[PDB]
CSV table of N, CA and C in Angstrom, one decimal:
chain,number,residue,atom,x,y,z
K,620,UNK,N,106.2,118.0,115.2
K,620,UNK,CA,107.1,117.2,114.1
K,620,UNK,C,106.6,116.9,112.7
K,621,UNK,N,105.8,115.7,113.2
K,621,UNK,CA,105.5,114.8,112.4
K,621,UNK,C,104.1,115.4,111.8
K,622,UNK,N,103.0,115.9,113.0
K,622,UNK,CA,101.4,115.9,112.2
K,622,UNK,C,101.4,117.2,111.1
K,623,UNK,N,100.7,116.6,110.4
K,623,UNK,CA,100.3,117.8,109.3
K,623,UNK,C,99.9,116.9,107.7
K,624,UNK,N,99.7,117.6,106.8
K,624,UNK,CA,99.5,117.1,105.3
K,624,UNK,C,101.2,117.3,104.8
K,625,UNK,N,101.3,116.1,104.5
K,625,UNK,CA,102.6,116.0,103.6
K,625,UNK,C,102.7,115.6,102.2
K,626,UNK,N,103.3,116.5,101.0
K,626,UNK,CA,103.3,116.0,99.7
K,626,UNK,C,104.2,115.6,99.2
K,627,UNK,N,104.5,114.5,98.4
K,627,UNK,CA,106.1,113.8,97.9
K,627,UNK,C,106.5,114.9,97.0
K,628,UNK,N,107.7,115.2,97.4
K,628,UNK,CA,108.4,116.3,96.3
K,628,UNK,C,109.8,115.3,95.7
K,629,UNK,N,110.3,114.5,96.1
K,629,UNK,CA,111.3,113.6,95.2
K,629,UNK,C,111.3,112.2,95.7
K,630,UNK,N,111.5,111.3,94.8
K,630,UNK,CA,111.5,109.6,95.1
K,630,UNK,C,112.6,109.3,94.3
K,631,UNK,N,113.7,108.3,95.1
K,631,UNK,CA,114.7,107.5,94.7
K,631,UNK,C,114.6,106.3,95.2
K,632,UNK,N,115.0,105.2,94.0
K,632,UNK,CA,115.3,103.9,94.2
K,632,UNK,C,114.2,103.1,94.6
K,633,UNK,N,112.7,103.7,94.2
K,633,UNK,CA,111.6,103.1,95.0
K,633,UNK,C,111.3,101.7,94.3
K,634,UNK,N,111.6,101.6,93.2
K,634,UNK,CA,111.2,100.3,92.5
K,634,UNK,C,111.9,99.4,93.0
K,635,UNK,N,113.3,99.5,93.4
K,635,UNK,CA,114.1,98.2,93.7
K,635,UNK,C,113.8,98.2,95.3
K,636,UNK,N,113.5,98.9,95.6
K,636,UNK,CA,113.1,98.8,97.1
K,636,UNK,C,111.8,97.8,97.3
K,637,UNK,N,111.0,98.0,96.4
K,637,UNK,CA,109.7,97.2,96.0
K,637,UNK,C,110.3,95.8,95.6
K,638,UNK,N,111.0,95.8,94.7
K,638,UNK,CA,111.4,94.5,94.2
K,638,UNK,C,111.7,93.9,95.5
K,639,UNK,N,112.5,94.2,96.7
K,639,UNK,CA,113.2,93.6,97.6
K,639,UNK,C,112.0,93.0,98.8
K,640,UNK,N,111.1,94.2,98.7
K,640,UNK,CA,110.0,93.5,99.3
K,640,UNK,C,109.4,92.6,99.0
K,641,UNK,N,109.3,92.1,97.7
K,641,UNK,CA,108.6,91.1,96.8
K,641,UNK,C,107.6,91.7,96.1
K,642,UNK,N,107.3,92.7,95.7
K,642,UNK,CA,106.1,93.5,95.0
K,642,UNK,C,106.4,92.8,93.7
K,643,UNK,N,105.1,92.5,93.1
K,643,UNK,CA,104.9,92.1,91.9
K,643,UNK,C,104.7,93.2,91.0
K,644,UNK,N,105.4,92.7,89.6
K,644,UNK,CA,105.4,93.9,88.5
K,644,UNK,C,104.6,94.9,88.3
K,645,UNK,N,103.0,94.3,88.1
K,645,UNK,CA,101.9,95.2,87.8
K,645,UNK,C,102.0,96.1,89.1
K,646,UNK,N,101.9,95.7,90.0
K,646,UNK,CA,101.8,96.5,91.2
K,646,UNK,C,102.9,97.5,91.5
K,647,UNK,N,104.3,97.2,91.2
K,647,UNK,CA,105.4,98.2,91.0
K,647,UNK,C,105.2,99.4,90.1
K,648,UNK,N,104.6,99.0,89.2
K,648,UNK,CA,104.5,100.2,87.9
K,648,UNK,C,103.4,101.2,88.8
K,649,UNK,N,102.1,100.6,89.1
K,649,UNK,CA,101.2,101.8,89.5
K,649,UNK,C,101.7,102.1,90.7
K,650,UNK,N,102.3,101.5,91.6
K,650,UNK,CA,102.9,102.5,92.6
K,650,UNK,C,104.1,103.5,92.3
K,651,UNK,N,104.7,103.0,91.3
K,651,UNK,CA,105.8,103.9,90.9
K,651,UNK,C,105.2,105.2,90.2
K,652,UNK,N,103.8,104.9,89.4
K,652,UNK,CA,103.1,106.1,89.1
K,652,UNK,C,102.7,106.9,90.0
K,653,UNK,N,102.3,106.7,91.0
K,653,UNK,CA,101.7,107.4,92.1
K,653,UNK,C,102.6,108.9,92.8
K,654,UNK,N,101.7,109.6,93.5
K,654,UNK,CA,102.8,111.1,94.2
K,654,UNK,C,101.7,110.9,95.0
K,655,UNK,N,101.8,110.0,96.3
K,655,UNK,CA,101.1,110.3,97.5
K,655,UNK,C,101.3,111.2,98.2
K,656,UNK,N,100.3,111.5,98.9
K,656,UNK,CA,100.3,112.3,100.1
K,656,UNK,C,100.6,111.5,101.1
K,657,UNK,N,100.9,112.1,102.7
K,657,UNK,CA,100.9,111.5,103.7
K,657,UNK,C,100.1,112.6,104.7
K,658,UNK,N,99.3,112.1,105.4
K,658,UNK,CA,98.5,112.7,106.3
K,658,UNK,C,98.7,112.2,107.9
K,659,UNK,N,99.2,112.9,108.7
K,659,UNK,CA,99.9,112.3,110.0
K,659,UNK,C,99.0,113.4,111.1
K,660,UNK,N,98.2,112.7,112.0
K,660,UNK,CA,97.5,113.2,113.1
K,660,UNK,C,97.2,112.2,114.1
K,661,UNK,N,97.0,112.8,115.3
K,661,UNK,CA,97.1,112.3,116.4
K,661,UNK,C,95.8,112.7,117.5
K,662,UNK,N,95.5,111.7,117.7
K,662,UNK,CA,94.3,111.7,119.0
K,662,UNK,C,94.4,111.0,120.4
K,663,UNK,N,94.8,111.8,121.2
K,663,UNK,CA,95.4,111.2,122.7
K,663,UNK,C,96.5,110.4,122.1
K,664,UNK,N,96.9,109.1,122.3
K,664,UNK,CA,97.7,108.3,122.3
K,664,UNK,C,97.8,107.5,121.1
K,665,UNK,N,96.8,107.6,120.5
K,665,UNK,CA,96.9,107.2,118.8
K,665,UNK,C,97.3,107.8,117.8
K,666,UNK,N,98.1,107.7,117.3
K,666,UNK,CA,98.7,108.1,116.2
K,666,UNK,C,98.0,107.4,114.6
K,667,UNK,N,97.7,108.6,113.8
K,667,UNK,CA,97.0,107.7,112.3
K,667,UNK,C,97.7,108.3,111.4
K,668,UNK,N,98.4,107.5,110.4
K,668,UNK,CA,99.0,107.9,108.9
K,668,UNK,C,98.3,107.5,108.2
K,669,UNK,N,97.4,108.5,107.2
K,669,UNK,CA,97.0,108.1,105.9
K,669,UNK,C,97.5,108.5,104.9
K,670,UNK,N,97.5,107.5,103.7
K,670,UNK,CA,98.0,107.9,102.4
K,670,UNK,C,96.8,107.7,101.3
K,671,UNK,N,96.9,108.9,100.5
K,671,UNK,CA,96.2,108.9,99.1
K,671,UNK,C,96.7,108.9,98.2
K,672,UNK,N,96.6,108.2,96.8
K,672,UNK,CA,97.1,108.2,95.7
K,672,UNK,C,96.6,107.5,94.8
K,673,UNK,N,96.8,107.6,93.3
K,673,UNK,CA,96.2,107.1,92.6
K,673,UNK,C,96.6,105.1,92.7
K,674,UNK,N,97.5,105.1,93.5
K,674,UNK,CA,97.8,103.5,93.8
K,674,UNK,C,96.8,103.3,94.8
K,675,UNK,N,96.7,103.7,95.8
K,675,UNK,CA,96.2,103.2,96.6
K,675,UNK,C,95.9,104.3,98.3
K,676,UNK,N,95.1,104.2,98.8
K,676,UNK,CA,94.6,104.9,99.9
K,676,UNK,C,94.8,103.8,100.9
K,677,UNK,N,95.3,104.2,102.0
K,677,UNK,CA,95.6,103.4,103.2
K,677,UNK,C,95.4,104.3,104.4
K,678,UNK,N,95.3,103.7,105.3
K,678,UNK,CA,95.3,104.4,106.7
K,678,UNK,C,95.8,103.3,108.0
K,679,UNK,N,96.7,103.7,108.8
K,679,UNK,CA,97.2,103.0,109.9
K,679,UNK,C,96.9,103.9,111.3
K,680,UNK,N,96.5,103.4,112.6
K,680,UNK,CA,96.5,103.9,113.5
K,680,UNK,C,96.9,103.0,114.7
K,681,UNK,N,97.9,103.6,115.6
K,681,UNK,CA,98.3,102.8,116.2
K,681,UNK,C,99.2,103.7,117.2
K,682,UNK,N,99.6,102.9,118.5
K,682,UNK,CA,100.0,103.3,120.0
K,682,UNK,C,101.6,103.1,119.5
K,683,UNK,N,102.6,104.2,120.1
K,683,UNK,CA,103.8,103.9,119.9
K,683,UNK,C,104.2,102.3,120.7
K,684,UNK,N,104.9,101.7,120.4
K,684,UNK,CA,105.5,100.4,120.9
K,684,UNK,C,104.5,99.2,121.0
K,685,UNK,N,103.5,99.5,120.5
K,685,UNK,CA,102.3,98.3,120.3
K,685,UNK,C,102.2,97.6,119.0
K,686,UNK,N,102.9,96.3,118.9
K,686,UNK,CA,102.6,95.8,117.6
K,686,UNK,C,101.2,95.6,117.2
K,687,UNK,N,101.0,95.6,115.9
K,687,UNK,CA,99.5,95.7,115.4
K,687,UNK,C,99.6,95.0,114.0
K,688,UNK,N,98.4,94.6,113.8
K,688,UNK,CA,98.3,93.9,112.3
K,688,UNK,C,98.3,95.2,111.0
K,689,UNK,N,98.8,94.9,110.3
K,689,UNK,CA,99.2,95.9,109.1
K,689,UNK,C,98.5,95.0,107.9
K,690,UNK,N,97.8,95.5,106.9
K,690,UNK,CA,97.6,95.3,105.4
K,690,UNK,C,98.2,96.3,104.6
K,691,UNK,N,99.1,96.0,104.1
K,691,UNK,CA,100.3,97.2,103.1
K,691,UNK,C,99.3,97.1,101.9
K,692,UNK,N,99.7,98.5,101.6
K,692,UNK,CA,99.2,99.0,100.1
K,692,UNK,C,99.6,97.6,99.0
K,693,UNK,N,100.7,97.1,99.1
K,693,UNK,CA,100.7,95.9,98.1
K,693,UNK,C,100.3,94.7,98.6
K,694,UNK,N,99.4,94.8,99.8
K,694,UNK,CA,98.6,93.7,100.1
K,694,UNK,C,99.2,92.7,101.0
K,695,UNK,N,100.4,92.9,101.5
K,695,UNK,CA,101.3,92.0,102.6
K,695,UNK,C,100.8,92.1,104.0
K,696,UNK,N,99.9,90.8,104.7
K,696,UNK,CA,99.8,91.2,106.0
K,696,UNK,C,101.1,90.9,106.7
K,697,UNK,N,101.2,92.1,107.3
K,697,UNK,CA,102.6,92.3,108.3
K,697,UNK,C,101.9,92.4,109.7
K,698,UNK,N,103.0,92.1,110.7
K,698,UNK,CA,103.2,92.4,112.0
K,698,UNK,C,104.1,93.9,112.0
K,699,UNK,N,103.5,95.1,112.3
K,699,UNK,CA,104.1,96.3,112.6
K,699,UNK,C,104.2,96.7,114.0
K,700,UNK,N,105.2,97.4,114.5
K,700,UNK,CA,105.8,98.0,115.2
K,700,UNK,C,106.3,99.3,115.3
K,701,UNK,N,105.8,100.5,115.4
K,701,UNK,CA,106.1,102.0,115.4
K,701,UNK,C,106.8,102.4,116.8
K,702,UNK,N,107.9,103.0,116.8
K,702,UNK,CA,108.3,104.0,117.9
K,702,UNK,C,109.1,105.0,117.5
K,703,UNK,N,109.4,105.7,118.4
K,703,UNK,CA,110.3,107.0,118.3
K,703,UNK,C,111.3,106.7,118.9
K,704,UNK,N,112.6,106.7,118.2
K,704,UNK,CA,113.8,106.3,118.4
K,704,UNK,C,114.9,107.4,117.8
K,705,UNK,N,115.7,108.0,118.9
K,705,UNK,CA,116.4,108.9,118.5
K,705,UNK,C,116.0,110.1,117.4
K,706,UNK,N,114.4,110.2,118.0
K,706,UNK,CA,113.9,111.4,117.3
K,706,UNK,C,113.1,110.9,116.1
K,707,UNK,N,113.5,109.6,115.4
K,707,UNK,CA,112.9,109.1,114.3
K,707,UNK,C,111.6,108.6,114.5
K,708,UNK,N,110.7,108.5,114.0
K,708,UNK,CA,109.8,107.6,113.6
K,708,UNK,C,110.2,106.3,113.0
K,709,UNK,N,110.3,105.1,113.9
K,709,UNK,CA,110.7,103.8,113.2
K,709,UNK,C,109.7,103.1,113.1
K,710,UNK,N,109.1,102.4,112.0
K,710,UNK,CA,108.0,101.5,111.4
K,710,UNK,C,108.7,100.1,111.3
K,711,UNK,N,109.0,99.0,111.9
K,711,UNK,CA,109.4,97.8,111.6
K,711,UNK,C,108.2,96.8,111.1
K,712,UNK,N,108.2,96.4,109.9
K,712,UNK,CA,107.3,95.1,109.4
K,712,UNK,C,107.7,94.2,109.5
K,713,UNK,N,107.2,93.0,110.0
K,713,UNK,CA,107.7,91.6,109.8
K,713,UNK,C,106.3,90.9,109.4
K,714,UNK,N,107.1,89.8,108.1
K,714,UNK,CA,106.0,89.0,107.7
K,714,UNK,C,106.7,87.7,107.0
K,715,UNK,N,106.2,86.6,106.8
K,715,UNK,CA,107.0,85.3,106.3
K,715,UNK,C,108.4,85.3,106.4
K,716,UNK,N,109.1,85.6,107.6
K,716,UNK,CA,110.2,85.5,107.9
K,716,UNK,C,111.2,86.5,107.6
K,717,UNK,N,110.3,87.8,107.2
K,717,UNK,CA,111.5,88.9,106.3
K,717,UNK,C,111.1,90.2,107.5
K,718,UNK,N,111.8,91.3,107.2
K,718,UNK,CA,111.6,92.2,107.8
K,718,UNK,C,112.0,93.5,106.9
K,719,UNK,N,111.3,94.9,107.1
K,719,UNK,CA,111.5,96.0,106.4
K,719,UNK,C,111.2,96.8,107.5
K,720,UNK,N,112.2,98.1,107.4
K,720,UNK,CA,112.0,99.2,108.4
K,720,UNK,C,111.8,100.6,107.7
K,721,UNK,N,110.7,101.6,107.9
K,721,UNK,CA,110.6,102.5,107.0
K,721,UNK,C,110.6,103.7,108.5
K,722,UNK,N,111.7,104.4,107.8
K,722,UNK,CA,112.2,105.2,109.0
K,722,UNK,C,111.5,106.7,108.3
K,723,UNK,N,110.9,107.5,109.5
K,723,UNK,CA,110.3,108.8,109.0
K,723,UNK,C,110.9,110.2,109.8
K,724,UNK,N,111.8,110.6,109.4
K,724,UNK,CA,112.7,111.5,109.9
K,724,UNK,C,112.3,113.1,109.4
K,725,UNK,N,112.3,113.9,110.5
K,725,UNK,CA,112.2,115.1,110.3
K,725,UNK,C,113.6,115.8,110.1
K,726,UNK,N,114.0,116.5,109.0
K,726,UNK,CA,115.2,117.2,108.6
K,726,UNK,C,115.0,118.7,107.9
K,727,UNK,N,115.2,119.7,109.1
K,727,UNK,CA,114.6,121.0,108.9
K,727,UNK,C,113.4,121.0,108.3
K,728,UNK,N,112.7,121.5,107.2
K,728,UNK,CA,111.8,121.7,106.7
K,728,UNK,C,111.0,120.3,105.9
K,729,UNK,N,111.6,119.5,106.2
K,729,UNK,CA,111.3,118.4,105.4
K,729,UNK,C,111.0,116.9,106.0
K,730,UNK,N,110.0,116.4,105.4
K,730,UNK,CA,110.1,114.9,106.0
K,730,UNK,C,110.6,113.6,105.4
K,731,UNK,N,111.8,113.2,105.7
K,731,UNK,CA,112.3,112.3,104.9
K,731,UNK,C,112.2,110.8,105.3
K,732,UNK,N,111.8,109.8,104.1
K,732,UNK,CA,111.1,108.6,104.4
K,732,UNK,C,112.2,107.8,103.9
K,733,UNK,N,113.2,107.0,104.7
K,733,UNK,CA,113.9,106.2,104.4
K,733,UNK,C,113.2,104.7,104.2
K,734,UNK,N,113.3,103.9,103.1
K,734,UNK,CA,112.7,102.4,103.2
K,734,UNK,C,113.6,101.4,103.0
K,735,UNK,N,114.2,100.8,104.0
K,735,UNK,CA,115.1,99.8,104.1
K,735,UNK,C,114.7,98.4,104.2
K,736,UNK,N,115.6,97.6,103.3
K,736,UNK,CA,115.1,96.2,103.1
K,736,UNK,C,116.6,95.6,102.9
K,737,UNK,N,117.2,95.1,104.0
K,737,UNK,CA,118.5,94.5,103.9
K,737,UNK,C,119.5,95.9,103.3
K,738,UNK,N,120.3,95.5,102.1
K,738,UNK,CA,121.0,96.0,101.7
K,738,UNK,C,120.3,97.3,100.6
K,739,UNK,N,119.0,97.5,100.5
K,739,UNK,CA,118.1,98.0,99.6
K,739,UNK,C,117.6,99.2,100.1
K,740,UNK,N,117.7,100.4,99.8
K,740,UNK,CA,117.2,101.9,100.5
K,740,UNK,C,116.4,102.8,99.5
K,741,UNK,N,115.3,103.1,99.6
K,741,UNK,CA,114.6,104.3,98.7
K,741,UNK,C,114.5,105.0,99.9
K,742,UNK,N,114.7,106.4,99.3
K,742,UNK,CA,114.5,107.8,100.0
K,742,UNK,C,113.4,108.6,99.0
K,743,UNK,N,112.5,109.1,99.9
K,743,UNK,CA,111.1,109.6,99.7
K,743,UNK,C,110.8,110.9,100.5
K,744,UNK,N,111.1,111.9,99.9
K,744,UNK,CA,111.0,113.3,100.4
K,744,UNK,C,110.1,114.1,100.5
K,745,UNK,N,109.6,114.6,101.6
K,745,UNK,CA,107.9,115.1,101.5
K,745,UNK,C,108.1,116.6,102.3
K,746,UNK,N,107.4,117.6,101.9
K,746,UNK,CA,107.0,119.0,102.3
K,746,UNK,C,106.0,119.1,102.6
K,747,UNK,N,105.3,120.1,103.4
K,747,UNK,CA,104.1,120.4,104.1
K,747,UNK,C,103.4,120.8,102.7
K,748,UNK,N,102.0,120.3,102.9
K,748,UNK,CA,101.3,120.9,101.2
K,748,UNK,C,101.0,122.5,101.5
């Protein structure tokens, strides 16, 4: 369902999501300009998600249900836990008393990414490269 190389097709409300997370102006602008890909692979029980763009190249590798340390593209040091829950890949990040959730869902031929922090949602839609 999730494995593949995915290209961004649309993005909505991303700047306001970033402001909620606490991202600063200069970083918001560079992140907003980018058109990342998302490359999802598996090796045994270890899942890797990579993203390449003009803003940041990032990579995380993790086991479902196992908390891990992540350094986000905007340089937050977070505690992350990623699970499958109702068929959705659910990524919770916790840092400095705050939490945000990134939901990666498969909907027909798309990978829909909903980034939620409290009342603020950004939706990014990807399709296979």
